[PDB]
């Protein structure tokens, strides 16, 4: 494999890609040699990792917390554009799976149901799944789901981006020292290293190691992960859906950052721990059903104290305040209960989270077409018809009709044609 000397990075205007040298592009990424350092030094830790029993190699980039998420997004787009050509399959959904790294311990039936929902959503929307980069818990489970997904696909394989805090990775020392294009470096998960003990997941297709000058400290990559997903969502005009299953304190921080950046979250109720805390908080503040009338702030505080173990009143107050701050906006939180509600209603919750956003109206109809929910699209169109807004409907009806034709959904074709979509006024995406 011949090492790349030049890379194709897409311009900030979004009209074409200009070709430039790799060292010029990679100068914008920084590393911290120590905690005291603020300005930093050039990173020089990027290349490809080879995992045992995996045919393809996985990219890694060590960046700093102060680095722009658009630059990391340009890096992911530039690699995919280099490998698969300009017309690679763009994502219409960014699915963030977060939760417990070590404390995740869940019944198998519950795991299969969550796995089934994630597999169908991912396979129907060609989603980019961004989880934590480590080989533990929900990240490992999501990795297994996308491992099975990677076999039936023929051309395009959706990236499984792993964003992990650098400094906890056992092969971190071996990746940084050396020349700047490291082609095919072997990653050894069983290799001994005294200070760090957390290995990378072998089923993830790409890796962003966020560094802030810290050894064995977690949760430093949360803000950048939320910002990177939000940046990706703006760039591809695709909704970002965060999914919360179980989780510890950093999952609470992940959900808090996600709700602050406008990204909707899907909380899996009944899986225990932080997900139960978030679900309890949302149900206390918003749910009008009879069984939630006995919900109190005291019982919520008891749940936070029993789950997170804050060991002080101020920490407990901050955790409770953060949990209540997550479920402040009722549109941005969708609570799915695993036990009481049905098995095939998880995608409806994901679609409800997509529909709960403000913009990307053509795209929301496209997501409704992907999940095969004709009634949701019909209700949205009827409400849109009653609410005026004729210019945006006419602007997106042609592209929606075109998209419905491409994915073989005749019911959507008849529905879009009934709502003043002229059959002879369609336009192609590219220019001949």
């Amino acid at each position: 494999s011949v090492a790349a000397k030049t890379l194709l990075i897409e311009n900030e205007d979004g009209k074409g890609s200009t070709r430039m040298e790799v060292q010029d592009f990679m100068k914008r990424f920084h590393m911290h040699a120590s905690e005291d350092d603020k300005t930093g030094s050039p990173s020089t830790a990027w290349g490809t990792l080879r995992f045992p029993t995996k045919e393809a190699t996985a990219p890694y980039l060590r960046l700093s917390v102060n680095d722009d998420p658009e630059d990391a997004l340009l890096f992911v787009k530039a690699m995919l554009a280099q490998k698969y050509g300009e017309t690679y399959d763009r994502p219409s959904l960014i699915l963030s799976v977060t939760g417990g790294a070590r404390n995740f311990t869940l019944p198998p039936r519950l795991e299969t149901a969550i796995a089934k929902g994630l597999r169908l959503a991912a396979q129907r929307t060609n989603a980019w799944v961004v989880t934590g980069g480590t080989n533990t818990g929900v990240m490992k489970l999501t990795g297994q789901i996308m491992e099975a997904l990677s076999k039936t696909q023929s051309h395009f394989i959706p990236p499984t981006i792993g964003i992990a805090t650098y400094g906890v990775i056992i092969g971190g020392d071996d990746m940084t020292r050396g020349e700047p294009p490291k082609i095919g470096l072997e990653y050894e998960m069983h290799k001994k290293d005294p200070p760090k003990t957390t290995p990378l997941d072998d089923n993830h297709n790409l890796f962003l190691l966020v560094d802030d000058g810290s050894t064995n400290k977690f949760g430093k990559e949360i803000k950048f992960r939320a910002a990177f997903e939000n940046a990706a969502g703006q760039a591809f005009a695709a909704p970002v859906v965060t999914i919360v299953v179980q989780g510890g304190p950093g999952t609470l921080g992940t959900a808090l950052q996600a709700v602050r950046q406008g990204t909707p979250i899907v909380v899996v109720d009944g899986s225990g721990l932080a997900a139960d805390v978030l679900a309890y908080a949302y149900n206390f503040m918003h749910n009008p059903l009879t069984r939630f009338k006995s919900y109190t702030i005291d019982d919520l505080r008891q749940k936070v104290a029993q789950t997170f173990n804050p060991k002080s009143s101020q920490q407990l107050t901050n955790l409770l305040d953060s949990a209540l701050e997550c479920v402040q906006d009722p549109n941005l939180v969708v609570v799915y209960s695993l036990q009481e509600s049905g098995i095939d209603e998880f995608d409806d919750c994901i679609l409800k989270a997509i529909f709960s956003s403000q913009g990307k109206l053509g795209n929301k109809l496209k997501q409704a077409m992907y999940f095969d929910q004709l009634d949701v699209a019909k209700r949205a169109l009827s409400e849109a018809s009653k609410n005026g807004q004729h210019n945006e409907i006419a602007a997106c009806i042609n592209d929606n009709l075109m998209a419905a034709m491409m994915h073989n959904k005749p019911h959507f074709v008849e529905l879009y044609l009934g709502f003043d979509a002229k059959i002879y006024e369609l336009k192609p995406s590219e220019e001949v």
């Binding site: 009008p288 009338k293 107050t317």
Partner: protein, 313 residues
Amino acid sequence: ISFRFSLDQQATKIPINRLNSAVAVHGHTAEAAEWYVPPEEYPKSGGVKRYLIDASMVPLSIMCPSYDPVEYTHPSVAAQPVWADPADPRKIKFNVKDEVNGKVVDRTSCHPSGISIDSNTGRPINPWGRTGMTGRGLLGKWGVNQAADTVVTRWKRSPDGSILERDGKKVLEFVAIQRQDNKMWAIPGGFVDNGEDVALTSGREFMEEALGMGTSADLMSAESKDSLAALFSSGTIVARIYCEDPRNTDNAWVETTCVNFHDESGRHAARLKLQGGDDAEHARWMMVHGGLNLFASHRTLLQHVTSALNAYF
């Protein structure tokens, strides 16, 4: 099942003979020295630190021979704007409505004892306790800085129209602004200007902060003006208390008059276009409960609002 619950709490829940048995559970732990002491670092002051005091050493009745406060006045206040009193506080009459440049200023405290005047320099002494710091600090007026707070409320309702109920009481929702200076959520409001009353001030601060309509967006429609006037025509003063504001000193303290504008039907509240302006970053509707972490003593103000409206807290 909702109606069954509603009829059950309307029929079961509709000093003399009252006993407290919490001493059997707790012991020597009870309500002891329930008094506010402001934080050591003064906000926006460039690192000047107060003189640290314990919470059992705050009230004036208790003796304090080791009291050595620091004299600090902020540069903005010391530059002499229109809303700031003169640096020599002599000839100013406290505890009665005083006219400065032909404009009326309140200057009366809600404390039963009143404001005591130091004989040596003529500066007022805070009756609500010691704060370990003399001078005016960030506050422009000697003595009582009158603030008006605007709690615009509506019942928290679901999409079906039913009012949300927690702990057998109806749940409220109030307009809250995020402050520019310390980034903690708070009730919209501001200091009472010279020559004006609480009526103009409460309404003006709510439009400037919560709505951002203080020369920063656009002119309201005739029905939007009529709706906002209808909302603002029925207000009840729920409390007039002493603020637990971190900018309080021994010679300048904030005292608030709280005005509640409650929208019972919810029609007038739904027409408000919330957008943080002036000294507010973001404005949003936020559920009223006892676990709220708000700036100064706004939780006490919300307690007074829920007490008056028989709402959840």
